[PDB]
Amino acid sequence: TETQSLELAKELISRPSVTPDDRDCQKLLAERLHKIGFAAEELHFGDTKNIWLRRGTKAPVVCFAGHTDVVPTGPVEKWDSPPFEPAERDGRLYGRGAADMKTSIACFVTACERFVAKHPNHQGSIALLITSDEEGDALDGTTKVVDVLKARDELIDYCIVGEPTAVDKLGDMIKNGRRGSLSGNLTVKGKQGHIAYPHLAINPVHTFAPALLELTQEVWDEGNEYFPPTSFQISNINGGTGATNVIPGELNVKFNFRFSTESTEAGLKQRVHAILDKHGVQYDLQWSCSGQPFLTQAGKLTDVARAAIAETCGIEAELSTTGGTSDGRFIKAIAQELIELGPSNATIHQINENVRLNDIPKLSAVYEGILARLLA
């Protein structure tokens, strides 16, 4: 069984690339892929490093997308082994970035190496889009690489984002899309006054109550074959001066939508306003959208990934759009078809982050199988 993937993963994890620091990870990757005909293009913005590695000049273009940065280790004393010294233990590889997502990068690199050796005259092109800021605000990250590629008409046919997607076993889940995120900051206005003279006041908690119930019980959409129903959740609610004999003058409420393709920004906003207004609520409602939903329908790419996983892992992969989001929300604008595929996301951002040792050669073989099915 191939051990190149594991060795490279350890090498990447050894570098403490906390966001947005890259610690020469992209330099490492460039120099290695240069050995098999990948040309490198640095696209640095601000303090963020990005790189666009590519072998070939013709379509179909297959792209692996990922990030080299990792989230902070947290309390280093709670770690059973140092987060930046990868260790094998109980059939698992422990280290920050072991699951999210340096292992995926290592697996794809070795997949290119084995694939190119078997098919030197493969059709199309293979590319890697690597950023040093995915976990942060990512203003200088993938979004600007995409803008540059879009502007010069360098489009992708198939993209695989190496984010960890597995629930339990490697390959049990593929992401063919994600929800958008629409946050709202609501300030309901009333009129402060002594609690014993309610008629000389307006309790914002009372006025908002009927609207609050309607919002929490609202069915926004029924989802579809790819998405669960659009989800509404209240994160914070705050009103009162601390005094138990005072009616507050205002009430603050912070809520959020994780919405599918069956809903839009405007549709959700107007409905939320209509609910508030028809209950006679007075308020300042301010809005914020951190991401839009994207989707790749079942097709050639999802079928190919599912087939590669069936051959390598021996299990039936399911499609999904649940969870948070990814840089796929930017890349989809230039990628005809895009999926996310990686190891288990159970330990991401947590202490003692890890991945199964046996899952590493498997993931690399899955990537290689996808390349073979698309380019050979």
CB-nearer residue toward a second copy: 247 or 304: 247
Minimum CB–partner distance for residue 110 and Zn ion (Å): 19
239 counts as binding a second copy under rule CB under 8 A: yes
Task: Tell whether residue 100 is among the known ligand binding residues.
Answer: yes
Interaction residues for a second copy, span 276-335 (CB under 8 A):
322-325
Question: Any idea of the CA torsion for 145, 148, 151, 157, to the nearest 10 degrees?
Answer: -40
Which member of 1, 57, 121, 244 binds a second copy (CB under 8 A)?
244
Question: What b-and-e string marks burial along 108-137, b requiring 16 or more CB atoms within 10 Å of the CB?
Answer: bbbbbbbbbeeeeebebbbbbbbbbbbbbe
339 counts as binding Zn ion under rule CB under 5 A: no
362 counts as binding a second copy under rule CB under 8 A: no
| d(C-alpha 178, C-alpha 261), whole Å | 9
| d(C-alpha 30, C-alpha 38), whole Å | 8
Please tell me which residue in 21, 22, 133, 134 is annotated as part of the active site: 134
67 counts as binding a second copy under rule CB under 8 A: no
Q: How far is CA 302 from the centre of its chain?
A: 18
Minimum CB–partner distance for residue 163 and Zn ion (Å): 5
- Give which of Zn ion, a second copy, none residue 276 binds (C-beta under 5 to 8 Å, depending on kind): none
Which member of 21, 22, 69, 100 binds Zn ion (CB under 5 A)?
100
Which member of 35, 121, 197, 225 binds a second copy (CB under 8 A)?
197
- Active site annotation includes 69: yes
160 counts as binding Zn ion under rule CB under 5 A: no
- Give which of Zn ion, a second copy, none residue 60 binds (C-beta under 5 to 8 Å, depending on kind): none
Please tell me which residue in 22, 69, 133, 327 is annotated as part of the active site: 69
Angle between helices 359-375 and 4-13 (to 10 degrees): 110
Give me the long-range contacts of 190-195 (CB less than 8 A, separation at least 24): 190/247, 190/248, 190/249, 190/250, 190/251, 190/282, 191/247, 191/249, 192/241, 192/246, 192/247, 192/248, 192/249, 193/246, 193/247, 194/245, 194/246, 194/247, 195/244, 195/245, 195/246, 195/247
Quick one: which H or E segment has residue 103?
helix 102-118
**Residues at the interface with a second copy (CB under 8 A):** 179, 183, 194-198, 203, 205-206, 209-210, 212-213, 216-217, 231, 233-248, 251, 254, 256, 258, 322-325
Binding residues: 67, 100, 135, 163, 349
Binding residues for Zn(2+): 67, 100, 135, 163, 349
**Residues at the interface with Zn ion (CB under 5 A):** 100-101, 163
